[PDB]
């Protein structure tokens, strides 16, 4: 009865069908197995060649030097409504919009040699006239890594991420458009949505492989975290650069933004947050989307990740 | 429920220590922590 | 109209090479002493558990090519030399070079690296091994530089054998394996206790009558005995698996084709088709998604320094000429004789 109530077997079967691994490996293995099974099919479909370094090479790679952004909240009892903005799938959206992957990374902006080039845990050599040809279709990352544009080469990670996202929104729409359906279709769509959520959360964990890795790239994760920090600070500046919305950002941990509206007729706070979200998304690439999703009329911000 | 120190593990330890009979090689679907060939094991508490 | 088996459990073991297993392109005069066989515990759509023996599926790994891109004759000699050296090193480490037990054959296939931006064809090897359990350790030697004089980068070595098998041939877990032919074993109606009569029904009888002839489809009970404690056990060949041939192979990475589609790999495309069928079941009309118009900028703090460094690198990485998107990749090394990775796995299959 307990395993039938939680739907463990059916959920694991659906997750295995979505990924393509053995039923035992769903709970016996980790998260690297699923993303590896995805990328291996993704590259065999396009005839790539994957690299498999050793343990001595991963440990000798460059360590992570970029950290995310966290705002120290002003510990106080807030009586006015506290609008809570939050981004959905920030890292996959970053990977899709800015076209970050292993097949698009060219190299660091500094120390661009012709023979001895280092990226992650591998060495390579740049061509003769590649920079003079691709000077137009590049998107330099704030961390200093060069990436090809989406017009010359489409990322395979971007393909998997956009597939996950579009089947996710399709399942959400299909579930939110039928109400009289039985529990069978609801259970099926919920299992599919949970599987896609697990996949979209694990797809980032395969980056930079801090320890016990198989194919890391510290530069990719560093650039992703840096552009996420830049997006966060740009959204903060956009919010604080409007005289009509006399708000202030007080707290946020790498995905959310807590703005304070002192005595602002919380019924209208919904429209205020909707306008703020529209203004934020209209200044970002296509897959980026800010979610309003809630209001906090009373709030007590104890410390970082400590509130109620 | 907690197959290590209970029904499955208990039976396995019993047939391994007392009767000296490899039941794990018999419950499998082939003639030639618990690893049963062909069949899966689920710890409900986990 | 296809024989369907689910993928509920997978396992691999070693056995002597039979007439259904490959025993011979690098060193054809040397036979194989042990070949791996995959065991797939599945269940028919009627509910009867089935055991399958897959042959011909061999692991492999790629390495950087040693020679040059310039007659299809020296390639065989180089592959034979590499195979001999690898076999000698493996036999010396693990304690006329006949009856190879570690490596089966070495081929030459072209590829494109994935760890980096490469837009040109690159030549690689295909070191087909026999025992995957030690194969990883073998790569360690290749990673340690003990086999050859210089260290070589390992390619496609962290992926296990079962994953490579289920990926190469487009199969997934808990999914059906569409196959059209098979080879039977010792009597299909196993009589361990009562399974010969308690589980038989009309559907299984029809499935047998459609796929079993009892004249040339059942193997001898002396050469291929039954070792499965369940229902009928079958033996499948890689030429019969129809799960493949559905993938859409693309080659838009050997040249600037993008510079001058939404349905990707099955289990995603399959899910999309199933959802469209559920919609066509008269549940509702249609699916749609509204797009939002956005206006990107997105410079950063170090944008000027990055632009200056890029200009300096372009000045450095340049030699007096002008690059063209059509004249960059040289129109030489046609590479028509070299086999593509998805065209090289059909090789080494024993026979029909």
GROMACS .gro file of N, CA, C and O in nm, chain A residues 16-17 20-21 33 41 44-52 98 102-103 105 109 112 119-122 128-129 131-135 138 140 142 148 151-153 156 159 163 169-170 173-174 177 192 214 216-217 230 281-286 288, chain C residues 8 111-119 121 124 153-158 160 166-167 171-174 248-250 253 256 258-259 262 264 267 271-272 275 278-279 284 287 292 294-295 298 300 306 309-310 313-314 317-319 321 323-325 328:
model
  476
   16UNK      N    1   1.315   0.607  -1.608
   16UNK     CA    2   1.404   0.524  -1.689
   16UNK      C    3   1.369   0.532  -1.837
   16UNK      O    4   1.457   0.535  -1.922
   17UNK      N    5   1.239   0.536  -1.868
   17UNK     CA    6   1.197   0.548  -2.007
   17UNK      C    7   1.238   0.682  -2.066
   17UNK      O    8   1.275   0.690  -2.184
   20UNK      N    9   1.673   0.639  -2.037
   20UNK     CA   10   1.716   0.526  -2.117
   20UNK      C   11   1.817   0.437  -2.048
   20UNK      O   12   1.900   0.373  -2.114
   21UNK      N   13   1.812   0.433  -1.915
   21UNK     CA   14   1.904   0.353  -1.836
   21UNK      C   15   1.828   0.236  -1.775
   21UNK      O   16   1.705   0.227  -1.784
   33UNK      N   17   2.517   0.951  -1.436
   33UNK     CA   18   2.483   0.846  -1.531
   33UNK      C   19   2.375   0.891  -1.628
   33UNK      O   20   2.383   0.864  -1.748
   41UNK      N   21   2.389   0.974  -2.653
   41UNK     CA   22   2.296   0.968  -2.764
   41UNK      C   23   2.300   1.097  -2.845
   41UNK      O   24   2.293   1.095  -2.969
   44UNK      N   25   2.621   1.072  -3.059
   44UNK     CA   26   2.612   0.968  -3.160
   44UNK      C   27   2.512   1.005  -3.269
   44UNK      O   28   2.525   0.960  -3.383
   45UNK      N   29   2.412   1.087  -3.236
   45UNK     CA   30   2.322   1.137  -3.339
   45UNK      C   31   2.391   1.235  -3.432
   45UNK      O   32   2.350   1.250  -3.548
   46UNK      N   33   2.496   1.302  -3.385
   46UNK     CA   34   2.570   1.400  -3.464
   46UNK      C   35   2.715   1.360  -3.488
   46UNK      O   36   2.793   1.443  -3.536
   47UNK      N   37   2.753   1.237  -3.455
   47UNK     CA   38   2.886   1.182  -3.483
   47UNK      C   39   2.997   1.267  -3.422
   47UNK      O   40   3.094   1.304  -3.488
   48UNK      N   41   2.983   1.299  -3.293
   48UNK     CA   42   3.091   1.361  -3.219
   48UNK      C   43   3.185   1.255  -3.163
   48UNK      O   44   3.165   1.134  -3.180
   49UNK      N   45   3.290   1.301  -3.095
   49UNK     CA   46   3.385   1.215  -3.025
   49UNK      C   47   3.405   1.273  -2.886
   49UNK      O   48   3.453   1.386  -2.872
   50UNK      N   49   3.368   1.197  -2.784
   50UNK     CA   50   3.378   1.243  -2.647
   50UNK      C   51   3.515   1.212  -2.588
   50UNK      O   52   3.583   1.117  -2.629
   51UNK      N   53   3.555   1.292  -2.490
   51UNK     CA   54   3.681   1.276  -2.421
   51UNK      C   55   3.660   1.213  -2.284
   51UNK      O   56   3.560   1.239  -2.217
   52UNK      N   57   3.755   1.129  -2.243
   52UNK     CA   58   3.749   1.059  -2.115
   52UNK      C   59   3.884   1.073  -2.046
   52UNK      O   60   3.972   0.987  -2.060
   98UNK      N   61   2.284   3.191  -2.403
   98UNK     CA   62   2.421   3.233  -2.430
   98UNK      C   63   2.504   3.128  -2.502
   98UNK      O   64   2.621   3.154  -2.532
  102UNK      N   65   3.060   2.243  -2.445
  102UNK     CA   66   3.196   2.201  -2.476
  102UNK      C   67   3.228   2.218  -2.624
  102UNK      O   68   3.343   2.247  -2.659
  103UNK      N   69   3.129   2.201  -2.711
  103UNK     CA   70   3.151   2.209  -2.855
  103UNK      C   71   3.157   2.352  -2.907
  103UNK      O   72   3.196   2.373  -3.022
  105UNK      N   73   3.290   2.617  -2.688
  105UNK     CA   74   3.397   2.687  -2.618
  105UNK      C   75   3.522   2.692  -2.705
  105UNK      O   76   3.567   2.590  -2.758
  109UNK      N   77   4.002   3.439  -2.307
  109UNK     CA   78   4.030   3.561  -2.380
  109UNK      C   79   4.177   3.599  -2.370
  109UNK      O   80   4.234   3.654  -2.465
  112UNK      N   81   4.602   3.365  -2.550
  112UNK     CA   82   4.554   3.291  -2.667
  112UNK      C   83   4.678   3.256  -2.749
  112UNK      O   84   4.725   3.335  -2.831
  119UNK      N   85   4.218   2.438  -2.178
  119UNK     CA   86   4.077   2.460  -2.146
  119UNK      C   87   4.029   2.342  -2.064
  119UNK      O   88   4.025   2.229  -2.113
  120UNK      N   89   3.993   2.367  -1.938
  120UNK     CA   90   3.949   2.261  -1.849
  120UNK      C   91   4.060   2.164  -1.814
  120UNK      O   92   4.154   2.200  -1.742
  121UNK      N   93   4.050   2.040  -1.863
  121UNK     CA   94   4.148   1.937  -1.833
  121UNK      C   95   4.206   1.881  -1.962
  121UNK      O   96   4.244   1.764  -1.969
  122UNK      N   97   4.213   1.965  -2.066
  122UNK     CA   98   4.264   1.922  -2.195
  122UNK      C   99   4.350   2.032  -2.255
  122UNK      O  100   4.343   2.148  -2.215
  128UNK      N  101   4.485   2.877  -3.775
  128UNK     CA  102   4.561   2.995  -3.816
  128UNK      C  103   4.471   3.118  -3.827
  128UNK      O  104   4.500   3.222  -3.768
  129UNK      N  105   4.363   3.108  -3.904
  129UNK     CA  106   4.278   3.224  -3.930
  129UNK      C  107   4.135   3.201  -3.883
  129UNK      O  108   4.040   3.233  -3.954
  131UNK      N  109   4.018   3.318  -3.563
  131UNK     CA  110   3.972   3.436  -3.491
  131UNK      C  111   3.932   3.547  -3.587
  131UNK      O  112   3.829   3.612  -3.569
  132UNK      N  113   4.013   3.571  -3.691
  132UNK     CA  114   3.981   3.675  -3.788
  132UNK      C  115   3.854   3.644  -3.865
  132UNK      O  116   3.791   3.736  -3.918
  133UNK      N  117   3.814   3.517  -3.872
  133UNK     CA  118   3.691   3.480  -3.940
  133UNK      C  119   3.570   3.482  -3.848
  133UNK      O  120   3.460   3.519  -3.890
  134UNK      N  121   3.588   3.444  -3.721
  134UNK     CA  122   3.477   3.435  -3.626
  134UNK      C  123   3.468   3.556  -3.534
  134UNK      O  124   3.393   3.551  -3.436
  135UNK      N  125   3.542   3.663  -3.562
  135UNK     CA  126   3.531   3.784  -3.481
  135UNK      C  127   3.390   3.839  -3.473
  135UNK      O  128   3.358   3.913  -3.379
  138UNK      N  129   3.069   3.569  -3.219
  138UNK     CA  130   3.117   3.527  -3.088
  138UNK      C  131   3.044   3.606  -2.980
  138UNK      O  132   3.000   3.719  -3.001
  140UNK      N  133   3.152   3.684  -2.605
  140UNK     CA  134   3.252   3.672  -2.499
  140UNK      C  135   3.183   3.665  -2.364
  140UNK      O  136   3.090   3.742  -2.335
  142UNK      N  137   3.176   3.687  -1.941
  142UNK     CA  138   3.243   3.771  -1.840
  142UNK      C  139   3.359   3.701  -1.771
  142UNK      O  140   3.452   3.768  -1.725
  148UNK      N  141   3.116   3.041  -2.949
  148UNK     CA  142   3.062   3.065  -3.082
  148UNK      C  143   2.916   3.106  -3.073
  148UNK      O  144   2.844   3.071  -2.979
  151UNK      N  145   2.451   3.119  -3.471
  151UNK     CA  146   2.435   3.119  -3.615
  151UNK      C  147   2.535   3.031  -3.687
  151UNK      O  148   2.514   2.997  -3.804
  152UNK      N  149   2.645   2.992  -3.621
  152UNK     CA  150   2.748   2.912  -3.685
  152UNK      C  151   2.742   2.768  -3.634
  152UNK      O  152   2.782   2.675  -3.705
  153UNK      N  153   2.692   2.750  -3.512
  153UNK     CA  154   2.685   2.617  -3.453
  153UNK      C  155   2.588   2.620  -3.336
  153UNK      O  156   2.601   2.705  -3.247
  156UNK      N  157   2.453   2.125  -2.851
  156UNK     CA  158   2.377   2.004  -2.823
  156UNK      C  159   2.313   2.009  -2.685
  156UNK      O  160   2.201   1.959  -2.667
  159UNK      N  161   2.003   2.191  -2.720
  159UNK     CA  162   1.896   2.108  -2.775
  159UNK      C  163   1.825   2.030  -2.665
  159UNK      O  164   1.702   2.033  -2.655
  163UNK      N  165   1.443   2.092  -2.535
  163UNK     CA  166   1.348   1.981  -2.542
  163UNK      C  167   1.285   1.955  -2.406
  163UNK      O  168   1.163   1.939  -2.395
  169UNK      N  169   0.656   2.237  -2.053
  169UNK     CA  170   0.545   2.330  -2.065
  169UNK      C  171   0.428   2.265  -2.138
  169UNK      O  172   0.311   2.295  -2.109
  170UNK      N  173   0.455   2.172  -2.230
  170UNK     CA  174   0.347   2.098  -2.295
  170UNK      C  175   0.271   2.013  -2.194
  170UNK      O  176   0.148   2.010  -2.195
  173UNK      N  177   0.061   2.245  -1.971
  173UNK     CA  178  -0.060   2.290  -2.039
  173UNK      C  179  -0.162   2.178  -2.051
  173UNK      O  180  -0.282   2.199  -2.030
  174UNK      N  181  -0.116   2.057  -2.086
  174UNK     CA  182  -0.208   1.944  -2.097
  174UNK      C  183  -0.274   1.911  -1.964
  174UNK      O  184  -0.391   1.873  -1.961
  177UNK      N  185  -0.540   2.199  -1.867
  177UNK     CA  186  -0.652   2.218  -1.958
  177UNK      C  187  -0.762   2.114  -1.943
  177UNK      O  188  -0.870   2.131  -2.001
  192UNK      N  189   0.583   1.215  -1.564
  192UNK     CA  190   0.665   1.272  -1.670
  192UNK      C  191   0.724   1.407  -1.628
  192UNK      O  192   0.842   1.435  -1.654
  214UNK      N  193   3.404   1.292  -1.444
  214UNK     CA  194   3.433   1.211  -1.562
  214UNK      C  195   3.462   1.299  -1.683
  214UNK      O  196   3.537   1.259  -1.773
  216UNK      N  197   3.477   1.717  -1.672
  216UNK     CA  198   3.447   1.850  -1.618
  216UNK      C  199   3.498   1.962  -1.708
  216UNK      O  200   3.577   1.941  -1.801
  217UNK      N  201   3.450   2.083  -1.679
  217UNK     CA  202   3.502   2.204  -1.742
  217UNK      C  203   3.473   2.319  -1.645
  217UNK      O  204   3.360   2.369  -1.640
  230UNK      N  205   2.567   3.857  -1.315
  230UNK     CA  206   2.545   3.978  -1.393
  230UNK      C  207   2.397   4.000  -1.419
  230UNK      O  208   2.347   4.113  -1.409
  281UNK      N  209   1.190   4.055  -1.798
  281UNK     CA  210   1.204   3.961  -1.909
  281UNK      C  211   1.220   4.032  -2.043
  281UNK      O  212   1.286   3.979  -2.133
  282UNK      N  213   1.163   4.152  -2.059
  282UNK     CA  214   1.181   4.220  -2.186
  282UNK      C  215   1.321   4.277  -2.204
  282UNK      O  216   1.346   4.343  -2.306
  283UNK      N  217   1.412   4.254  -2.109
  283UNK     CA  218   1.550   4.299  -2.120
  283UNK      C  219   1.649   4.182  -2.112
  283UNK      O  220   1.765   4.202  -2.075
  284UNK      N  221   1.604   4.061  -2.147
  284UNK     CA  222   1.687   3.942  -2.138
  284UNK      C  223   1.667   3.855  -2.262
  284UNK      O  224   1.573   3.880  -2.339
  285UNK      N  225   1.751   3.755  -2.286
  285UNK     CA  226   1.730   3.666  -2.401
  285UNK      C  227   1.597   3.592  -2.392
  285UNK      O  228   1.525   3.598  -2.293
  286UNK      N  229   1.567   3.520  -2.500
  286UNK     CA  230   1.436   3.457  -2.515
  286UNK      C  231   1.401   3.360  -2.403
  286UNK      O  232   1.294   3.376  -2.342
  288UNK      N  233   1.484   3.328  -2.100
  288UNK     CA  234   1.479   3.380  -1.965
  288UNK      C  235   1.338   3.426  -1.933
  288UNK      O  236   1.274   3.496  -2.013
  362UNK      N  237   1.391  -0.494  -1.890
  362UNK     CA  238   1.373  -0.489  -1.746
  362UNK      C  239   1.503  -0.510  -1.669
  362UNK      O  240   1.515  -0.463  -1.556
  465UNK      N  241   3.617   1.126  -3.710
  465UNK     CA  242   3.532   1.182  -3.607
  465UNK      C  243   3.559   1.330  -3.587
  465UNK      O  244   3.649   1.388  -3.648
  466UNK      N  245   3.478   1.390  -3.501
  466UNK     CA  246   3.491   1.530  -3.465
  466UNK      C  247   3.495   1.539  -3.313
  466UNK      O  248   3.404   1.490  -3.245
  467UNK      N  249   3.599   1.598  -3.253
  467UNK     CA  250   3.605   1.607  -3.107
  467UNK      C  251   3.491   1.690  -3.051
  467UNK      O  252   3.440   1.781  -3.116
  468UNK      N  253   3.451   1.657  -2.928
  468UNK     CA  254   3.343   1.728  -2.861
  468UNK      C  255   3.392   1.825  -2.755
  468UNK      O  256   3.320   1.920  -2.722
  469UNK      N  257   3.512   1.804  -2.701
  469UNK     CA  258   3.568   1.892  -2.598
  469UNK      C  259   3.649   2.002  -2.668
  469UNK      O  260   3.772   2.001  -2.673
  470UNK      N  261   3.576   2.099  -2.723
  470UNK     CA  262   3.638   2.208  -2.795
  470UNK      C  263   3.567   2.241  -2.925
  470UNK      O  264   3.484   2.163  -2.971
  471UNK      N  265   3.599   2.356  -2.984
  471UNK     CA  266   3.535   2.400  -3.108
  471UNK      C  267   3.622   2.355  -3.225
  471UNK      O  268   3.717   2.422  -3.264
  472UNK      N  269   3.588   2.239  -3.282
  472UNK     CA  270   3.657   2.185  -3.398
  472UNK      C  271   3.557   2.167  -3.511
  472UNK      O  272   3.452   2.106  -3.493
  473UNK      N  273   3.591   2.221  -3.629
  473UNK     CA  274   3.501   2.217  -3.744
  473UNK      C  275   3.567   2.140  -3.858
  473UNK      O  276   3.542   2.168  -3.975
  475UNK      N  277   3.726   1.734  -3.991
  475UNK     CA  278   3.731   1.590  -3.970
  475UNK      C  279   3.863   1.549  -3.907
  475UNK      O  280   3.970   1.597  -3.947
  478UNK      N  281   4.049   0.877  -3.607
  478UNK     CA  282   4.062   0.807  -3.480
  478UNK      C  283   4.069   0.658  -3.506
  478UNK      O  284   4.043   0.610  -3.617
  507UNK      N  285   4.552   1.040  -2.540
  507UNK     CA  286   4.424   1.073  -2.481
  507UNK      C  287   4.322   0.963  -2.509
  507UNK      O  288   4.316   0.909  -2.620
  508UNK      N  289   4.243   0.930  -2.408
  508UNK     CA  290   4.141   0.826  -2.420
  508UNK      C  291   4.008   0.891  -2.458
  508UNK      O  292   3.973   0.999  -2.408
  509UNK      N  293   3.934   0.825  -2.547
  509UNK     CA  294   3.807   0.875  -2.596
  509UNK      C  295   3.702   0.766  -2.583
  509UNK      O  296   3.725   0.652  -2.624
  510UNK      N  297   3.586   0.802  -2.526
  510UNK     CA  298   3.474   0.710  -2.508
  510UNK      C  299   3.517   0.587  -2.426
  510UNK      O  300   3.502   0.473  -2.468
  511UNK      N  301   3.570   0.615  -2.308
  511UNK     CA  302   3.614   0.510  -2.216
  511UNK      C  303   3.539   0.510  -2.084
  511UNK      O  304   3.528   0.404  -2.021
  512UNK      N  305   3.486   0.624  -2.040
  512UNK     CA  306   3.409   0.630  -1.917
  512UNK      C  307   3.268   0.573  -1.934
  512UNK      O  308   3.202   0.546  -1.833
  514UNK      N  309   3.008   0.290  -1.982
  514UNK     CA  310   3.012   0.145  -1.964
  514UNK      C  311   2.966   0.072  -2.089
  514UNK      O  312   2.918   0.130  -2.186
  520UNK      N  313   2.316   0.001  -2.542
  520UNK     CA  314   2.180   0.054  -2.551
  520UNK      C  315   2.175   0.186  -2.628
  520UNK      O  316   2.067   0.223  -2.677
  521UNK      N  317   2.289   0.253  -2.641
  521UNK     CA  318   2.291   0.385  -2.709
  521UNK      C  319   2.317   0.363  -2.857
  521UNK      O  320   2.243   0.420  -2.939
  525UNK      N  321   1.823   0.186  -2.808
  525UNK     CA  322   1.728   0.118  -2.717
  525UNK      C  323   1.718   0.201  -2.588
  525UNK      O  324   1.808   0.282  -2.566
  526UNK      N  325   1.611   0.185  -2.509
  526UNK     CA  326   1.602   0.254  -2.377
  526UNK      C  327   1.559   0.155  -2.268
  526UNK      O  328   1.522   0.042  -2.303
  527UNK      N  329   1.566   0.195  -2.141
  527UNK     CA  330   1.522   0.111  -2.031
  527UNK      C  331   1.371   0.109  -2.019
  527UNK      O  332   1.303   0.209  -2.042
  528UNK      N  333   1.318  -0.009  -1.983
  528UNK     CA  334   1.174  -0.030  -1.967
  528UNK      C  335   1.097   0.001  -2.095
  528UNK      O  336   0.979   0.038  -2.091
  602UNK      N  337   1.801   0.973  -3.689
  602UNK     CA  338   1.834   1.062  -3.800
  602UNK      C  339   1.975   1.114  -3.779
  602UNK      O  340   1.998   1.206  -3.700
  603UNK      N  341   2.071   1.053  -3.849
  603UNK     CA  342   2.211   1.092  -3.836
  603UNK      C  343   2.237   1.221  -3.913
  603UNK      O  344   2.195   1.235  -4.029
  604UNK      N  345   2.307   1.315  -3.849
  604UNK     CA  346   2.336   1.444  -3.908
  604UNK      C  347   2.487   1.463  -3.919
  604UNK      O  348   2.564   1.412  -3.837
  607UNK      N  349   2.843   1.918  -3.902
  607UNK     CA  350   2.957   1.963  -3.823
  607UNK      C  351   3.091   1.946  -3.893
  607UNK      O  352   3.194   1.986  -3.837
  610UNK      N  353   3.094   2.444  -4.247
  610UNK     CA  354   3.003   2.550  -4.207
  610UNK      C  355   2.871   2.539  -4.282
  610UNK      O  356   2.841   2.620  -4.370
  612UNK      N  357   2.559   2.525  -4.116
  612UNK     CA  358   2.463   2.613  -4.050
  612UNK      C  359   2.482   2.757  -4.094
  612UNK      O  360   2.384   2.831  -4.108
  613UNK      N  361   2.606   2.800  -4.115
  613UNK     CA  362   2.633   2.935  -4.161
  613UNK      C  363   2.613   2.952  -4.311
  613UNK      O  364   2.590   3.064  -4.357
  616UNK      N  365   1.281   2.027  -3.459
  616UNK     CA  366   1.245   2.029  -3.318
  616UNK      C  367   1.238   1.888  -3.260
  616UNK      O  368   1.287   1.866  -3.148
  618UNK      N  369   1.374   1.580  -3.154
  618UNK     CA  370   1.504   1.519  -3.133
  618UNK      C  371   1.484   1.371  -3.098
  618UNK      O  372   1.379   1.314  -3.127
  621UNK      N  373   1.206   0.875  -2.737
  621UNK     CA  374   1.188   0.878  -2.589
  621UNK      C  375   1.160   1.024  -2.553
  621UNK      O  376   1.126   1.051  -2.436
  625UNK      N  377   0.764   1.050  -2.674
  625UNK     CA  378   0.673   1.110  -2.577
  625UNK      C  379   0.586   1.217  -2.643
  625UNK      O  380   0.467   1.228  -2.614
  626UNK      N  381   0.645   1.296  -2.733
  626UNK     CA  382   0.568   1.398  -2.804
  626UNK      C  383   0.460   1.334  -2.890
  626UNK      O  384   0.346   1.381  -2.894
  629UNK      N  385   0.182   1.212  -2.671
  629UNK     CA  386   0.098   1.322  -2.623
  629UNK      C  387   0.007   1.374  -2.734
  629UNK      O  388  -0.109   1.407  -2.710
  632UNK      N  389  -0.274   1.133  -2.753
  632UNK     CA  390  -0.369   1.159  -2.645
  632UNK      C  391  -0.456   1.280  -2.675
  632UNK      O  392  -0.575   1.283  -2.641
  633UNK      N  393  -0.398   1.382  -2.738
  633UNK     CA  394  -0.476   1.498  -2.779
  633UNK      C  395  -0.574   1.462  -2.890
  633UNK      O  396  -0.689   1.507  -2.889
  638UNK      N  397  -0.900   1.739  -2.626
  638UNK     CA  398  -0.913   1.881  -2.653
  638UNK      C  399  -0.862   1.908  -2.795
  638UNK      O  400  -0.828   1.814  -2.868
  641UNK      N  401  -0.253   2.220  -2.900
  641UNK     CA  402  -0.154   2.281  -2.812
  641UNK      C  403  -0.092   2.402  -2.880
  641UNK      O  404  -0.079   2.408  -3.002
  646UNK      N  405   0.704   3.589  -2.641
  646UNK     CA  406   0.717   3.724  -2.589
  646UNK      C  407   0.829   3.796  -2.663
  646UNK      O  408   0.938   3.741  -2.680
  648UNK      N  409   1.128   4.035  -2.695
  648UNK     CA  410   1.233   4.080  -2.605
  648UNK      C  411   1.336   4.162  -2.681
  648UNK      O  412   1.352   4.147  -2.803
  649UNK      N  413   1.405   4.250  -2.609
  649UNK     CA  414   1.504   4.340  -2.666
  649UNK      C  415   1.634   4.326  -2.587
  649UNK      O  416   1.649   4.387  -2.481
  652UNK      N  417   2.439   4.252  -2.441
  652UNK     CA  418   2.450   4.253  -2.296
  652UNK      C  419   2.595   4.267  -2.252
  652UNK      O  420   2.659   4.169  -2.214
  654UNK      N  421   2.929   4.389  -2.028
  654UNK     CA  422   2.962   4.370  -1.887
  654UNK      C  423   3.072   4.465  -1.843
  654UNK      O  424   3.110   4.556  -1.917
  660UNK      N  425   3.789   4.271  -2.267
  660UNK     CA  426   3.769   4.151  -2.347
  660UNK      C  427   3.781   4.181  -2.496
  660UNK      O  428   3.842   4.103  -2.571
  663UNK      N  429   4.153   4.231  -2.574
  663UNK     CA  430   4.223   4.103  -2.577
  663UNK      C  431   4.187   4.024  -2.702
  663UNK      O  432   4.273   3.958  -2.761
  664UNK      N  433   4.061   4.030  -2.744
  664UNK     CA  434   4.020   3.960  -2.866
  664UNK      C  435   4.088   4.020  -2.989
  664UNK      O  436   4.131   3.947  -3.078
  667UNK      N  437   4.448   3.903  -2.985
  667UNK     CA  438   4.458   3.763  -3.025
  667UNK      C  439   4.436   3.746  -3.175
  667UNK      O  440   4.506   3.667  -3.240
  668UNK      N  441   4.340   3.819  -3.231
  668UNK     CA  442   4.317   3.813  -3.375
  668UNK      C  443   4.438   3.864  -3.452
  668UNK      O  444   4.473   3.811  -3.558
  671UNK      N  445   4.697   3.557  -3.382
  671UNK     CA  446   4.654   3.437  -3.454
  671UNK      C  447   4.606   3.476  -3.594
  671UNK      O  448   4.487   3.475  -3.625
  672UNK      N  449   4.703   3.510  -3.678
  672UNK     CA  450   4.674   3.549  -3.816
  672UNK      C  451   4.803   3.539  -3.897
  672UNK      O  452   4.910   3.577  -3.849
  673UNK      N  453   4.791   3.488  -4.019
  673UNK     CA  454   4.906   3.473  -4.107
  673UNK      C  455   4.865   3.487  -4.253
  673UNK      O  456   4.822   3.594  -4.297
  675UNK      N  457   4.673   3.739  -4.554
  675UNK     CA  458   4.564   3.679  -4.629
  675UNK      C  459   4.433   3.715  -4.560
  675UNK      O  460   4.431   3.779  -4.454
  677UNK      N  461   4.046   3.542  -4.447
  677UNK     CA  462   3.969   3.417  -4.436
  677UNK      C  463   3.827   3.431  -4.487
  677UNK      O  464   3.759   3.532  -4.466
  678UNK      N  465   3.781   3.327  -4.556
  678UNK     CA  466   3.646   3.321  -4.609
  678UNK      C  467   3.573   3.202  -4.549
  678UNK      O  468   3.632   3.097  -4.522
  679UNK      N  469   3.442   3.219  -4.528
  679UNK     CA  470   3.361   3.111  -4.471
  679UNK      C  471   3.350   2.992  -4.565
  679UNK      O  472   3.315   2.882  -4.519
  682UNK      N  473   3.784   2.856  -4.605
  682UNK     CA  474   3.863   2.823  -4.487
  682UNK      C  475   3.900   2.675  -4.486
  682UNK      O  476   4.019   2.639  -4.484
   0.00000   0.00000   0.00000
